[PDB]
Amino acid sequence: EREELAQQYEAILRECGHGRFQWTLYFVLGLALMADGVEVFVVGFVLPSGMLGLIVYLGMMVGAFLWGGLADRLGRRQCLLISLSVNSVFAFFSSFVQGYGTFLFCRLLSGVGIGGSIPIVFSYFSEFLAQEKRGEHLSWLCMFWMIGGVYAAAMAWAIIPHYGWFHSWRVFVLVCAFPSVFAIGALTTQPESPRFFLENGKHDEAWMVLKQVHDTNMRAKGVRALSLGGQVWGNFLSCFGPEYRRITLMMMGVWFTMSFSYYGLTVWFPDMIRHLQAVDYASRTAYMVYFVSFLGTLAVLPGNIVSALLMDKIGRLRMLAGSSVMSCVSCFFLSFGNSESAMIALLCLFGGVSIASWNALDVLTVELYPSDKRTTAFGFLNALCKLAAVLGISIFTSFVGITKAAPILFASAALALGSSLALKLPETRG
Numbered sequence: 423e424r425e426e427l428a429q430q431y432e433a434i435l436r437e438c439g440h441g442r443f444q445w446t447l448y449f450v451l452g453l454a455l456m457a458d459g460v461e462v463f464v465v466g467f468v469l470p471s472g473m474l475g476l477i478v479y480l481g482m483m484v485g486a487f488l489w490g491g492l493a494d495r496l497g498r499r500q501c502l503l504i505s506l507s508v509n510s511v512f513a514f515f516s517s518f519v520q521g522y523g524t525f526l527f528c529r530l531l532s533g534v535g536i537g538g539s540i541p542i543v544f545s546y547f548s549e550f551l552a553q554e555k556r557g558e559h560l561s562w563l564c565m566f567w568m569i570g571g572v573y574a575a576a577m578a579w580a581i582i583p584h585y586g587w588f589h590s591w592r593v594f595v596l597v598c599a600f601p602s603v604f605a606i607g608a609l610t611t612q613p614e615s616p617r618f619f620l621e622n623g624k625h626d627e628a629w630m631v632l633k634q635v636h637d638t639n640m641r642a643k644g645v646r647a648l649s650l651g652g653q654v655w656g657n658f659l660s661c662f663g664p665e666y667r668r669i670t671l672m673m674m675g676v677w678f679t680m681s682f683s684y685y686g687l688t689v690w691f692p693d694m695i696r697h698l699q700a701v702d703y704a705s706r707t708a709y710m711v712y713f714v715s716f717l718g719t720l721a722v723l724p725g726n727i728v729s730a731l732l733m734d735k736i737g738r739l740r741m742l743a744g745s746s747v748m749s750c751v752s753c754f755f756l757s758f759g760n761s762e763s764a765m766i767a768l769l770c771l772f773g774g775v776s777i778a779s780w781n782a783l784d785v786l787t788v789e790l791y792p793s794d795k796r797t798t799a800f801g802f803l804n805a806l807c808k809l810a811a812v813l814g815i816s817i818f819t820s821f822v823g824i825t826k827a828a829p830i831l832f833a834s835a836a837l838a839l840g841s842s843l844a845l846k847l848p849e850t851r852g
């Protein structure tokens with residue numbers, strides 16, 4: 423059977439243990455994750471300055487789907503390189519645009535290019551880990567997304583603290599697209615994931631890559647489209663086979679509900695705080711939007727740190743359930759606070775409580791699936807997560823003049839479903 427390879431692969435990985443290659447690559451892929459976070463922030467609160475920016479999320483959905491499909495048929499480095507090239511190129515041309523009609527098209531294309539940055543990055547770094555510290559390392563890697571969000575927020579506040587409606591978004595977009603260019607430049611000098619080569623049958627190339635990794639670690643101590651179009655459906659439609667069906671549906675449900683809840687709440691908080699400030703002003707009778715939720719992303723890092731060292735001591739399923747429950751209880755408790763500083767503190771707490779669940783999610787998604795679908799399934803789940811994000815943003819933007827209890831209960835129900843499904847997932851023996 424085409425299954426008795428992971429044993430020898432992990433025996434080799436544990437024999438080499440951990441060294442400096444898994445730190446160099448850690449940072450190289452963290453750069454791409456940082457660029458993805460920068461893009462997500464730019465599309466979230468900076469772009470709508472007319473909340474039609476969800477077309478960018480749709481573009482990122484299509485991108486994540488396509489890149490997840492193509493990653494295992496083109497490798498985890500060629501696909502990542504192409505995705506980051508498309509992103510950087512289009513997000514750099516977005517600064518020489520002439521208005522909105524073409525600017526939003528360029529941003530949509532950049533989103534399509536950068537959608538396949540979380541799935542490929544996480545799978546690629548998962549195929550270089552010893553599996554006894556896999557969860558902790560992946561959780562640490564996740565922090566670069568928050569670093570990217572913080573970087574984008576700081577640059578946006580320092581450069582463009584105003585509303586679009588001589589040139590501001592041009593220089594701002596250059597600064598925001600710098601990280602993707604740096605990620606490409608740093609990633610040009612990495613080897614394609616060895617497990618991909620082993621699955622392709624080119625065991626010689628996989629052995630060469632593994633030997634190069636060992637050398638790096640030892641320093642211390644036309645018709646082609648048809649073939650590549652029907653073959654990606656092999657990875658996807660097989661992800662609904664008898665073996666991986668219940669796992670995949672539960673995974674889809676967890677991703678959908680929890681991403682929807684998080685994105686809805688993160689768009690809600692700045693709006694509700696702004697409305698409260700407006701009410702305070704009436705009581706007398708965007709320079710702060712990049713401070714709000716920027717402090718949230720800064721206060722999330724403690725949660726990620728607490729969810730990284732304990733990611734393996736407790737388990738990759740307990741952690742998930744016990745973080746989803748806490749996230750749901752925090753969403754319920756959000757209504758308790760009715761101020762500005764209190765609301766900011768509650769937002770920071772909720773972010774720090776949900777980041778642990780997110781990290782457990784990303785560890786479990788890459789652990790469950792085999793080498794063949796480790797990226798196709800992850801890309802599909804990320805596309806569904808972005809669909810849920812679009813739905814959450816659209817729903818939560820509507821709730822302005824409606825009582826906060828409605829969004830509170832909506833997010834609480836979504837997180838309750840997420841927690842139930844996560845607790846209902848299979849064990850870690852997969």
Ligand SMILES: Cc1cnccc1CN1C[C@@H](c2cc(F)c(F)c(F)c2)CC1=O
Binds near residue numbers: 722784
């Ligand atoms: C790393 C990652 C892995 N897989 C899929 C997506 C991602 C990227 N993130 C981060 C998540 C997040 C949730 C929070 F509640 C926070 F407070 C926070 F700061 C960040 C939301 C998301 O989509």
